[model samples]
Target chain A: LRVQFKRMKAAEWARSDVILLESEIGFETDTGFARAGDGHNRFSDLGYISPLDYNLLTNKPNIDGLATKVETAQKLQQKADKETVYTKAESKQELDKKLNLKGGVMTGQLKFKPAATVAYSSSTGGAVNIDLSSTRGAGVVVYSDNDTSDGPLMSLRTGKETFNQSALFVDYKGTTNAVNIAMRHATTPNFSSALNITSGNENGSAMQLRGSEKALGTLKITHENPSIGADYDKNAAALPLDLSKRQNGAGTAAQGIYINSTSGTTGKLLRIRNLSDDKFYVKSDGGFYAKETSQIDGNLKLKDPTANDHAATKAYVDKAISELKKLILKKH
Target chain B: LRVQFKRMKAAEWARSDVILLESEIGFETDTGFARAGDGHNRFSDLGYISPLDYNLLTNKPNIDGLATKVETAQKLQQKADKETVYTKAESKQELDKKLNLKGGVMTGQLKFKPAATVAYSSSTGGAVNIDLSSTRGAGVVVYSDNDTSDGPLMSLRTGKETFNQSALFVDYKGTTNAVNIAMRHATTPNFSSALNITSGNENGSAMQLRGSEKALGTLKITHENPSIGADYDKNAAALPLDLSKRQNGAGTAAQGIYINSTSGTTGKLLRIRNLSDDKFYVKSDGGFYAKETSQIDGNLKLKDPTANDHAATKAYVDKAISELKKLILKKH
Candidate 1:
């Protein structure tokens, strides 16, 4: 019998139900035999067949089947090979994005999961030291609350450390107020002065000076008032006291000095007692009497009795002499 | 004519240079006739044979060529089918990596571009509310500068709401210094005291207490000194004044009180004015006299003047009577 051939397109082949292998029966070509089936049901009794079965029936090897299997395996291998090999640029791109490093410099925010820590050391897998010992630098600034509506809560800058320049600056800008504290080197290298300025809605604007420990002085200037206070160590008592208060009495208790005795006994030493009745007295105790009924036990001396008239002076001398005689008798 | 078939290895078949089914030529395996090419130079003049050419030569259908095309198409279709049918796990793995979610929980950081904000609302599609209104636990702690060398820059923890427990803690650990501010409940819920502690290498440690505004008090404790100050309002003038200073002469200046008049006139209401010549005078004016030539305006009262002899008594009485007579005449 003769065999006729037909050509079909790729799409038609996919849509057609023509299976190419089936049972023990096989079809033969001019060169070899191949297993054939009706056009439906793949791998079933009507569509499935082994190459050996075709070879056995036709007494010929199924070269077509073997060629098909080899071709499919080669295609899969090619896909895997392409996946394994990467170009140099591709590898570098991946690493750059992962490490945030570009051109040997690192930038970008580094995040660590909670409870993770970065340990530092002098050796392997540790410390990262930024040495600026020889570099000309403007210094470092630290900012806080950068991501909130309250704005920068604070910023601190360590001034450049050069032969001619040194400074420390701190600025705190909160929602309703702002405070700035700055210290700059003075004429002498070892000397520096600090100034603090505060302004905003909570209170009046004020500026204060922060002095050295030895001369711990503060000069504060406010809107309605100005004040100066000196800080002292345990021996502040050794310093001279110069205090002034304004007659306007802007402060509730204008000025005061308080002393607390740690011994818990009598706190008063000498008292110039003033009474509500317009009377005044000198006493060792803090309390005072309103009337003169209190006894006085001390020698009473007058300025001079001799300058008076003779009658008055004679009467005073007689009384003084009589009292002196009584006192002598009592002693004897 | 009928042709007999033979089996050959696929590679040998590919290499052989035999021709079949040229003019009036035919080859057959058990049930069919066929035509073939010279196993090399496929689809060319030396070995090429069209399907129609084979069909005409064989007088039977070219089932072998058709079977080969069908098999290749089948293999390719099988590959396409396998690609289209993805397993459930494959799909899930793809989605998990893309969404950064694993088992219903998000496993990656949600980073926003610069200047973006997380908006909140009571009811909306774009809001996340952390409800702690009825909870009895401590509030959140905000941290910053955590991943850098500065370490934890600040941590703010709000207090829990309970009868016996209330607190607000803030700790700022900067590169050079650390400051901690804490407020806790005292004997009562309404009463709380704030304590600020600062320690660093730049300066000595210091602790300060911030009292309420009504009883505005400050207690500062430094490394070498500690002090307490109280604030007063309008009633400070009514308080009793009891003050004393140390007897030590270490102070550069001694105790003094200065009162400035708001009217800008004479500031000396009562002055115990002193001069450079170790002379002093009690005057309303600030100037004091070294010599007796300065005139005295106010009345001068003596403690006692009667104890002198007769001549002094006569002189004193004459002067006093003259002055008294002048004053009486002027009054009349």
Candidate 2:
């Protein structure tokens, strides 16, 4: 229980005969080395040195890696905060080197997948205008608004000028994927799945498909919305309404072609041309015209059976044939 | 300061200036109306009701918007914890709907940009094995590890059974961006700039460039490493080495074709085929063979003039031609 201090020569300090009680200090006079005793009666060097550990110290000592205040070493070892570290700046090469991005073609296909499907909520029902539910903020989300989009958000620039070396490609694998790529309106209730391709410098169709498998392929156009359920009925229920009810309330919401055009806008919503000739057209004003004979697949209904402006139905033609027989009888 | 209670008819309770002192209660005998006053000289209804605020209460009352205990309403009004809320589940349509993602073709273009330049550092000089410096985690990093890559990481799935539409597009509209697109070796000391395009189903060349601007285009193949400085000299310095020292120490670090191959691998590093013929070859074993003529743009140095297998240098060839001219005089 008594505080005590022991002093000895360097040689005597190594002598194993002496034992210092807990809280006792032992100093070596010859080397200025010091040791302290713990409750267990063991001795440990008092301070750190670059090469060796002396058994003693007489007063306060200096330390390395500790800089200033005690315990500073532990806190400093942590990774430097990002806010204070020197940023690489607009070092394009550095970025190119780090991210492995290339202005030029990079050989070999790459792969990426979201870490996991982030569970996020979105009240898309009551209000489609609602913001996407707050996400866990994960995975990589590449976006840019550096002036013009012609530079593309992310893409491989093909040949210098002449369009050589097919610039893009997507090969199939596994089961038939629903869609490989999409360009949709972010908040357009009138349209969902939409894509447009145009080439101002060519005479070819804006889009086309060619290959052995293309022989039997048919260009199919249809409406699809996730807000709606799977089947028509499911979709109707997901729409939270009856199909007829929805059509009556928000007709364009269920319309195949919903053109939200400016007032007084007049033009064909659908048009097909042969050379310079307009072969088929569905005018914006609801006019339908075609160079080829029009055929109806199902039963044809007319506004008025006797009106010259309306087309005759199959039933009308059959009755006319019967009339021909009556004419023969009258003549006879 | 005395607490008092007042009971009155509805008509009397409505009488103005009937101030109930602090902590005093006044009640309407007819309608069970009640009111309590505070030091500020105002009265507040005791509890809540569906549509109306009753000015009085005869006893303990029920409240709307507040379930069970007091303060519960305030806590419940906060956004629900994500872990407890219902996740949209694997509703592909729902996902398609929420994210504006489509399994079908989406028309138009999209853009993305990082909010700001992120500063990141890498010890690319000492060890290329180090992970990229911790980033601010800004900008989108699109990545996926789906079951199969034939579907592509982020790509526009082209025509169905046949390939047709240009699945990916990167139009130009600005000063040449440092990199319109990039595919690089994420971590390869031997190579930095790399691109490879191959097709297993056809006889076409792996790659080609054809266009008006491509007429005089040169298929330039050069090694590029961003870790290095701007030019060769700068890069040499970025190499942080003496050409002689590095060649002797880590030669491949500066080699244009530093093929890091596994032991026992025996094959050609570069090869050109003429149908079934292997026309040109740079064997993995360091052997070079070609069917056509070879031209040297620089001085052709000979390894050893005395060695029979060693090809003669231009100097040796010129000396031989001189000897041939002397032989003509000797022949005369």
Candidate 3:
């Protein structure tokens, strides 16, 4: 689990109408998050000869360049201590909150140490909404299943002292693993209904709860900044894998939310994966919530035919990347 | 008795701490209230004099020289057409409520209208106190007997809406009266004692309470502006006579209060023996409370040795002159 404590001046907090937090899914190198790689940029020397491969190459050429750039950038970045920028009325200080992931990868269970609590009232009608937008680095991972399950994948809690908390629990059978997201609140009516991500056996994209629900807007969700090995695995594949995974032998303590596809022609049965692996794969170490038929790659760019939903997904991912650059990349 | 209503702009009232009311006095011609004669040029027999007196000669001369200079001054004045001065925060137009005594000497009563319910708290840590001083010229007349007596020479009213209403009646008894002085909310206690001047036992200066008393801090007293007459009382001996008369009406009025006196010797008396008079006399008409006995002079000559009360006396006169100028003076 990665954690950070960012201190903002009192005035800034007062001026802002609301604060937003989000969950990210892309994997990050020191320079940028890795998405895809061209054929020649990988171990294979395939060129952009065919339309099919060219499509993959076209979509992912920047990944290899970024990888090379990340190497030299690290040396330049190390020349000084971390840099900080303050907005109009805000003074900021970076506190010693351990947010660094081992081996640039994380998987299994992830939790932020200090959970956020709901403290203010909402202007846009009163409804307790938690923002999962402030998350940075790699995109978040999620799990799914064909069977209708009663339990939620994520849990949230709300009160003065009780911070809304969510945990990505590893569970699934076969080759893919399942990640559950649950949320609960003291005042939220039917709080469980907010955490539901899917209709039983329905072939649809996962349901999302986003935007500001109330005055205390959101708690961000983000993938751990990815490792180099996972970046390579994702780029080497001719086609993007069901989900990217951390490299084997990387630190197992850090957990990451996995992203993958379930209903495609190359549909994988089930899997337990880490953020360190470059590409998604099946594993025997299923978590406490693991079921035999659940799939892990429910949030990837496949099978979800809703254009609006897909647009939203892409927008969220892009936003996460942008925010990461502001928080981490720019500072470096 | 002459009551006229003008919709005063709020700005002027807000800007002025005090406003002048014409009262029962009416405007008349005779240049009695004119500027003082130039002691030098007009009296060329006297050689060189002050520049102020030079201006006084050109204008009408019975009035105080300073009063004319102040009224005609082009600097530090607000024009009549534009009587209002804008006040910040209050967001209102305040007009200077003014009463102009153009020329003929007249007797009248003035009342103060405070914006809010006001209580003149005494510096003595008591309720309130009021004191009045007046000067008279030849032929000016006034009457104050044991009847119609109130402890306050100037009485201030207190009630829901009527609070802050205070009145002082001024009678034009002197032929060449130029100024009267009064102070409210004086720094001293028992300050507003009434003056009952009588030679020996017959014209004894008596306070209704018979001795000095403390004053409330918020008490406010008012004095009539300088009034004047066109000519001197050449027939000084024809007027009624009294033991209290000053110079047998030679060129002076039986002014109740005067400088150059100990035990009330130099100051003129308020009463006059019935007689024909060539010049008018100015006096303070009866209607004030005497909380205590204190030496109070009505006419104070700045140049005279008896002007030992110069500091306090000048302060009183200066205030009235300053306020009058503020009303009539034109700013560049």
Candidate 4:
């Protein structure tokens, strides 16, 4: 008795919706399975041979080179099987080896080797480095997540001393923007400070130190030669100072100081000074007084002193002179 | 012909390279089958027995205890099979019952009972509370994701009358930090407001309000006596007011008002007053003027009347004197 298979053409097989393989099927050396619509036999699973191998083996070989060509084809098939057929365990082991991780359920902590270094490099020439080496002290160096040329987003280093040297550094290297560092005392108990540095397109650079609460002090500095200062003494004793020292030309300094008093009428209520001249001015309920010699500088002509005065000025002057003479004679 | 399995010692089994179970096997009490080389065992057909029955049957007779022990063991085995070996339907029912949801694909909203409170507590002791009770008027209380002691990150109360009473409060309870509240009119619009409060380690506290446009007023109050006010006029008619009332000694008040000129050199530019002495002063491009008596009480001095004079000072003075004389003689 003999068993045989009724073969169907590739076109018939392709047209069928479902092709069932109820029993084991085997292919002979160079005749396997492929789609037939294209009319050209470009794809086949006949022992996993390449196009060149198919060409060499399908055509009638020259008798002189037949032995060597047959040997080469056998070698190629052996290589294909060796490279392709792998057990599930073997495949997993190979993957784990490449990723540098140990396999098996992966339940516990997974860590990089002490000396291993991981880096992520971008197409635009930006790179992030995660160094685990003891030599460099471990750190995670991060590049900008979006812009390649924008430099670093943050870097965290372990085993370093100072903040600038090794702590976390978050930087925004935009051309026109600002960097802010804020610190808080507690989570909900009302307290914080913000140190902000801003670079503007037209106004130059400025830095501001801001605090919460009436007792906190603040300082703001601008590149335009003016600075602001505030004292944080609660509402009990608050003082604000604005100082500007601008130099227009050589030996000409324009300096100004504004001291705003918040206390209820005591000492040094208001002070305004110009450094160009040695003029000190003070104004109070007693009178307006200047430390330097008083001068009209433009004209000596006096307006009528009695313009707003209701009394007779001549009689009052004569009486004042007689009283002054008596006082002078007594003092002498 | 009959096939037999020759039993081997435990040590011999352990040392063997492979052991195969060709067919179904059974143990006297519990039986398990295992594959060759892999050392993985699967259990099946086990005859459960209790110690009393086992003792009675395997050893000498204890006829009185044998039936009860056998019955107990049979009942236990029945219960184990009923609980552990569930059908597909039974498994799904168990899952749905535990989740408190209906059986199906679970594609709709799942809610708790009306009185049930939903709380998410973190492993680090942080917790979020969503209370729907009418007593509290409905609110969501969220603690910080990190520190539990930092207090609530946000609390939103629905039925209060004022902002402090009913608004959504986002708090930063940091011992040394800030809280910020930002409001946007719309997602794709140009209206926004930022209200930020900060507390510093040494500076006390401060509150700042910032708007996206210029039509927002700013008010600053220090612990000191001076306060600043601004009008929300969109720079079209922007007016800034600075008022300071400082008292020196008793009954002496130094009060000033500075109204910045915004109408192109028109309107009142500045006004200053000493309320204790009833002295009112004004400054304009024309000249300085005082409403009260003016006197050089400290000194009477003179200087070059034309050092930097641009116009003829003598002519102007003569014209002024002539005009004044005419007015005085006519009045007399």
Candidate 5:
């Protein structure tokens, strides 16, 4: 055989960890002589297991676990970077740029599901306090001063000092005696939802949520304003805790809420807590049902241009609940 | 034969003032002796007219010349009454009772077509006030205060004081100004009419007749309150003597007169004058047109249900007006 002299430079080939063995066709080491014709790495000659043949060889050190541990460490490093370093920077940058834009991997989807079980406390005393300032306007104050109120010592008060040059001084103050869940616009000030209060006893307690100068929206309640006192107290005519119970809607009987009395300064105080529960249900005295039906019919007639018959529709709703019940019973 | 018996008692039947005349039937004498039947008694009857009848038969006296004199008397009467009668009515009962109910027959309308008229003068300086106590509940007062006015001031004062506890007091006097027509229901008093003076004119030239409070009824102009000056001489504004100019209609705008830019006090001092011309005209403000039309249509519909479709019905008033206007203005 003719031997060709092939010399390799150290500068060109830096790592000579293993040299190609010409006899074995892969690599040859000093431990054994390998055949050059076969397409296999003879680890026996190099005295080391090949990466490709490590699993096949049983008597080798298990390095697979170490590799898996390395992979896990890498993933953990990425997560740690996301939380410990990248989170604050990303959040700050996003806030500074006011970038609430959606549709990107950078911004992940967050689904806020209402908690399945929430243990609400009834005695938290998280009552809403309404502070009415007279500085807004005299008319607003006047109207607010006349609105209904509840809770202990609900009152209209003037500021310690006048803010602006005003002809009149007025302010409204209210305190909720108990805790309630309020559903309202979170970001927008002054826009709020109705508060739902769960009563603790048969004597439904009252809360006063008042506007600055006037009453804004209707208050809904779960129960009626009731007299929880004993017969002795009732006979003695003790002042009822709920003013509505004592007065029974006898005052002003104004546009929104029913007032207790018509005369004297004693009747001027409004009862916010003990409002009627029938707000959703309509009553006959200017109630919603009577008003809405009449309004619809009136508008229909008004909008109907033809004198003879534009409204071929004059509907009559069926309200025979007892008849339906009887038919059902007969079917049974 | 019966005449022979009657001759014994003929001296008893003799008439003192008798006259005899001849007739064709029988003989008659002063004592019926030689006449056919023409015995008559003709005593020259002299007719005496009572003071009441004298004024009635004479017709409305020449009130023109006496107008000034009466006006002066009114001024004196007003001044004196304010000083004495209004300030202290302790002697009201005695003077009112003594004053004759029919004392002044100045404008009597019994005999003359227009009426009797009288002249009050400087010589008659006494105050003419009516006693309202006697006619308290009768709705018509014959007297007030204690003085008896000679002219229609009595009829003018037939009304009570506009601010009277017993009667309505209709006027008042001040140092430099006066209110002409004041009214009251108990202590609640109002100025129904007044004579206001413009500035610079120390005396009130512009007289106004204001309507009643809330303008419930007519506001008549009785007297114009006189404005005063420091000169001590009474140079007052003259009231309009014409009847047509003095009347006010039924509303506040019917004040019908106004004085601009006068000191409020001077305007109030003027006296109400010309009671005869001061009258209230009963007029309407045209608010009842729709109501009246509605009522007519309602009644017609009740009478004949189909009347609403008729052209003659009130429901067709707009159509009728449109058609009528069209026809009338067709040529134009």
Candidate 6:
């Protein structure tokens, strides 16, 4: 056991930090290796070292394109504004190689074929973010040859053809005043629409809301013709809007159409304006308001008056008139 | 003026292959640094080396987690299935940190906020690409709480308001059968629609194509009500279509509606089919085909038949009858 000169195991030798002078051998008993030191506090191992088994704890081999951990970390942690960014000062060759080496600022187009989707499943930080805070240009611009081909530039379909789901959703929270969505048309567009809805099935309506819901906002279809001028007659017979419900005939409190404002408020519910923009026909605060005249094609059923009921039924009025006449006759 | 011992410059010393023994120093004249060699072929520098100045062409220093330059490129060039794929053997902690280190496959969701767009400017290879080539699940599934909010899942608007442009464009080219853009509602949806288009301006139609353009695809509003006995009356007066061009009175070829197929093809330009599935009234290839009785509210002026351009007008027929009667009186 004591046949070696200044002997120590590998761990013991590493822990000792004792410098070995020239021609002075420090034996590693466990691994059968020898360590020799130069005048500097560094040592060299005279043992066969495995390249693959280079341990972080000990071995320091010369590696090309390999920076030390401190050096590599410094290179990697170079300050950019936010995420990894490339500067303009980089050489073209350096920048080009860097993108593939590490996913960073890349300048070029990326292409994907059909059925390709950019997924952000529960990615609260936004899967793909493009900030246009002060730019008039669109975030995305596409020039599709729809005459020869057809598909949605943006779609929300993720499943079978026979299901229901929203393909797109928008959540906006900002103090600035801005439109959530806007659609328009070009001057020279052909067979195009700002909003096109094509129903594959016959049962579905083109644009319909589910039952037991409210529009909240006004649903208006304005006419371009001037109401007071010669353009009036052309638009007079024009019914650009239609509101009707299919008669199911179950009589389950079915209403042809129900539109009302919030309860207990003097809100304008239904308004029909004239050329002067006066609400000539309106229902507000649960009261039907019609100025100038009122006509009913059928019976006007009114409840017999109580202490607070001012408006009386036609029959009630007639009966009261006859009773008063009979009292006059009895007095005569 | 050289100082002493075998002196050489920095580059000269690096170029020389000579080795110096212990206590034998080769001095660098340009920098005045000394290099001393051991019994082995390696040398140690008496000059202090800057930590960052590790030149890849020469310097090989001991560093933690350091490998040789040859080995670094080998690890960087490790092949995987696609761009950058990590296999099953990678430890969990290693994989978790890899995504942020380099942009790659990440599981979980990516969320976005107001005015966030995934832009692909001039991208011919579809923007927002998702390949659900062989999956029953949707390419994009969005759950919106529209009952309390309102916005579009996808929109195309790039400029100030008060203009016209197509918001969406579809260009489909594939041999296989597929729905270019499919939308559907859920079983228990409230205030929902597969495709809902609400016009902000009254002048714009809810769904309208550009004027002076032919509708290549049939714009049909099919009714779900059957033509059989029970459902017949339900759809009797249902005018699901209204084609009207507002009269400008200048009469610049103002058409209430103009519909015609190709001039030469034997095509059914307009077909009105009956409950028997027969096209009782149709305009085909410039020919009007009426199968049943035709009633003319006004006089039908026809050129005289027998090569006289056929069937005479009603007045002409009466005139011929009077002449025949006069001839009969003359014979008597």
lDDT of each: 0.27, 0.32, 0.22, 0.27, 0.21, 0.36
Residue-by-residue lDDT tens digits, candidate 2, B87-163: 34533323342222111221222232223222122221110011211221111223333533332334432222222
Model 6, span B229-264: residue lDDT tens:
432333122121222223453212111223432123
* Candidate with the greatest DockQ versus the true structure: 1
Alpha carbon deviation, residue A216, candidate 2 (Å): 7.3
Name the runs in model 6 displaced over 4 angstroms.
A1-332, B1-139, B145-148, B160-221, B226-229, B236-239, B243-254, B261-263, B275-279, B282-287, B305-313, B330-332
Decide which is better by DockQ, 2 or 6.
6
Tens-place lDDT digits, model 3, residues B218-256: 111112112132112211111111212122222212221
User: Comparing 1 and 3 by TM-score, which wins?
Assistant: 1
**Tens digit of lDDT per residue, candidate 3, span A256-285?**
112122211121112222333212222212
Q: Which residue segments of model 1 deviate by more than 4 Å? A: A1-62, A65-95, A98-332, B1-212, B218-332
Shift in Å, residue A330, candidate 5: 99
Using all chains and alpha carbons, the TM-scores for the candidates as numbered come to 0.27, 0.19, 0.12, 0.23, 0.12, 0.33
Best by TM-score: 6
Q: Identify the CAPRI category of the predicted complex in candidate 4.
A: incorrect
Kindly list the per-residue Cα lDDT of model 4 for residues A104-125, writing each as its tens digit: 2222222121211221122111
Query: What range of 10 consecutive residues in model 1 chain B has the weakest lDDT sum?
Result: B160-169
DockQ score of the complex predicted as candidate 5: 0.00
| Cα RMSD over interface residues, candidate 6 | 21.6
- Candidate 6, A115: how far from true, in Å? 15
Give the top-scoring candidate (lDDT). 6
Q: Model 5: residues >4 Å from true position, as ranges? A: A1-90, A93-332, B1-332
Q: Give DockQ per model, in order.
A: 0.05, 0.01, 0.00, 0.02, 0.00, 0.03
lDDT of prediction 2: 0.32
Error of 5 at A67 (Å): 7.5
Cα lDDT tens digits, model 2, A127-238, are 1111212322222223332322222223433334433223333232234332223433222122211232323322222233221111111122212222222232221111
**lDDT of residue B84 for candidate 6:** 34
Model 6, A1-332: lDDT tens digits are: 11234556678866675767764555554444444555345333432211223332244454545567566446444323212222333323343443332234323333332232443444222333333433333444434433322334444333445433344433333322122333333333344334555433333333342222122221222233322344333423222222122245221211111232211223333334443453332222233333443332222223454443233334444455456545545431
Top-down TM-score ranking: 6, 1, 4, 2, 5, 3
> Candidate 2: deviation at residue B179, Å?
19
DockQ of 2: 0.01
